[PDB]
Amino acid sequence: TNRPNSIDPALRRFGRFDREVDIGIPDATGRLEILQIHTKNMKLADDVDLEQVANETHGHVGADLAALCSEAALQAIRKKMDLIDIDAEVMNSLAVTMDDFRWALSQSNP
Amino acid sequence: QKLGSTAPQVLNTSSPAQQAENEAKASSSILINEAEPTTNIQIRLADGGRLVQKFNHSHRISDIRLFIVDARPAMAATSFVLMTTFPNKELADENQTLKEANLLNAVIVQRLT
Amino acid sequence: AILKQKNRPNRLIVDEAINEDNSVVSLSQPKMDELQLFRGDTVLLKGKKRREAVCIVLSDDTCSDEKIRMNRVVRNNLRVRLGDVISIQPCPDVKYGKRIHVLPIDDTVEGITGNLFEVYLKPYFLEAYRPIRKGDIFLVHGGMRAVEFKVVETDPSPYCIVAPDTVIHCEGEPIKREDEEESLNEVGYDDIGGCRKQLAQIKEMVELPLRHPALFK
């Protein structure tokens, strides 16, 4: 659930649904771990830090980090534009920069 | 099949394996000159939409007939009057070449009589 | 950059000519040599609003020798604006016509229904090699008047040529002038200002379904 008190309190008695655990939001090193395990199947441009990016993201949920990664990939698509159709010269030259991550973090909605 | 006044079309009598061999023989029987500006002439065949581009700089319309005969053996007996794309003229005078008849990269539309 | 869209690619330019021929339009002879096009060959000129046009492009200098210009009727057929763009593709469309296809529009016509026996069918459309197309509201000669007829579709690969001997067969139904400029909500990026930044953002959101499913790597 997204809210603990919005559920009926009769379902939270001592016979049913007793253990309460919250996933919460990760830490800055936690968000660095999220970025590391999310950007595995993506070619970085080897200049990104992803820990400066993690410290720049405070109060961010993991799906928001996925949204920032998707917008960074869209920035790499837009900035390195090409022609119309496969155009395989763009397949082997994908690159996201730390400045592109900063630009994506500028238009971010946590 | 209605009893119309149009001419009866001829199907592709040549084999599909013999089509590529006939096209290769037609390209081999026509010389290519590198010292003259070559042109390519599209022949609008009426047997299904077949057009071929293999020509030299100067050829007669009878040489285009030779290219047609080497392209397809069944079309050697059909009488045809060649046409163009709206100057509304009929391409007679088979001894005339492409330069004198303004057939420089011009699509010749083949119409069977 | 900040907004890397709304870019014209290496695309051919559209303008308006004054030629008499309807299915034959005029294309630039230096552009004919550049795009390796033939004198008599017909191609597809890719306008916007999901509309293309099939016409024979000649080597005529009556239009611009830089811009490819066509008829006023073809301009209404392509449903485009002055200064638009067209892609060039030499793929042929030479298939003959099959059956009844037209719809009689009765503005200035001879033989109101017509039905396969007409002065603008048997003498005029024969020996012409015009590519008859789905939605061809043509203004051609024949039958003593400036005739105007709509065609619903043609059967084999809907943009296809006519035969010099086989007469095009005709339906009979009295219909009138349509409203194609605003009927199917054909207006696109040309008739919406809005926020062009947000129009570009919508375009960027729809790039990946549009012709690039494999751009997900």
Q: DSSP string of A57-105?
A: --S--HHHHHHHHHHHHHHHHHHT-------TTTTT-----HHHHHHHH
Q: Which two tokens stand for residue A71?
A: 């917008």
A7 inside 8 A of chain C by CB: no
Chains that contact A by 3+ CB pairs under 8 Å?
C
Q: For the packed helices A62-79 and A98-106, what is the interaxial angle rounded to 10 degrees? A: 120
Q: Cα separation of C100 and C169, whole Å?
A: 4
Chain A contact set for C7 (CB, 8 A): 81
Residue located via tokens 């919508």:
C202
> Which amino acid, B72?
R
For residue C16, the surrounding DSSP H or E stretch is: strand C12-16
Chains A and B touch (3+ CB pairs under 8 A): no
Chains C and A touch (3+ CB pairs under 8 A): yes
Q: Which two tokens stand for residue A10?
A: 């009769």
A45 inside 8 A of chain C by CB: no
Q: Which two tokens stand for residue C2?
A: 């900040």
Instruction: Give the 3-state secondary structure of residue B7.
Output: coil
Q: Cα separation of C160 and C55, whole Å?
A: 10
Q: Cα separation of B92 and C151, whole Å?
A: 35
- Residue A5 assigned ligand-binding role: no
Q: Which of C12, C48, C215 best tests the A interface by mutation, with the highest count of A CBs <10 A?
A: C215
List, in order, residues 6 or more apart from A78 with CB less than 8 Å away: C4, C5, C204
Asked if B85's CB is within 8 angstroms of C39's CB, the reply is yes
Calculate the CA dihedral of residues A92, A98, A99, A100 and round it to 10 degrees: 50
A84 inside 8 A of chain C by CB: yes
Q: Are C17 and C82 in contact (CB under 8 A)?
A: no
CA distance C210 to chain B (A): 32
Q: Which parts of C63-183 are beta strand (E)?
A: 68-70, 85-86, 88-89, 102-104, 131-132, 138-140, 147-151, 160-161
Q: Cα separation of C115 and C136, whole Å?
A: 17
List, in order, residues 6 or more apart from C20 with CB less than 8 Å away: none
For residue B83, the surrounding DSSP H or E stretch is: strand B80-83
Closest residue in A to C214 (Cα) is A86
Closest residue in C to A79 (Cα) is C1
Q: Cα separation of A64 and A73, whole Å?
A: 14
Q: Cα separation of C25 and A48, whole Å?
A: 55
List, in order, residues 6 or more apart from C3 with CB less than 8 Å away: C197, C200
Q: Cα separation of B67 and C5, whole Å?
A: 50
C164 inside 8 A of chain B by CB: yes
CA distance C15 to chain A (A): 23
Edge-first strand order for the sheet with B90-91 is: B43-44, B108-112, B80-83, B90-91
Half-sphere exposure at residue A38, Cβ-oriented, CA atoms within 13 angstroms: 19
- Comparing CB atoms, the residue among C211, C214, C215 nearest residue A77 is C215
- Determine the number of helices (DSSP H) and then strands (DSSP E) in chain B: 2, 4
CA distance A79 to chain C (A): 6
Q: Are C22 and C140 in contact (CB under 8 A)?
A: yes
Asked if C211's CB is within 8 angstroms of A85's CB, the reply is yes
List, in order, residues 6 or more apart from C102 with CB less than 8 Å away: C114, C149, C150, C151, C152, C168, C170, C171
The resolution, in angstroms to one decimal, equals: 4.2
Asked if C58's CB is within 8 angstroms of B109's CB, the reply is no
List C-alpha distances in Å: C162 to A102, B1, C12, C22, C180: 60, 19, 27, 14, 25
Q: Cα separation of B16 and C148, whole Å?
A: 43
- Residue A38 assigned ligand-binding role: yes
CA distance C71 to chain B (A): 15
The neighbouring-strand residues paired with C88 are: C45
Q: Which parts of A1-110 are beta strand (E)?
A: none
Method: cryo-EM
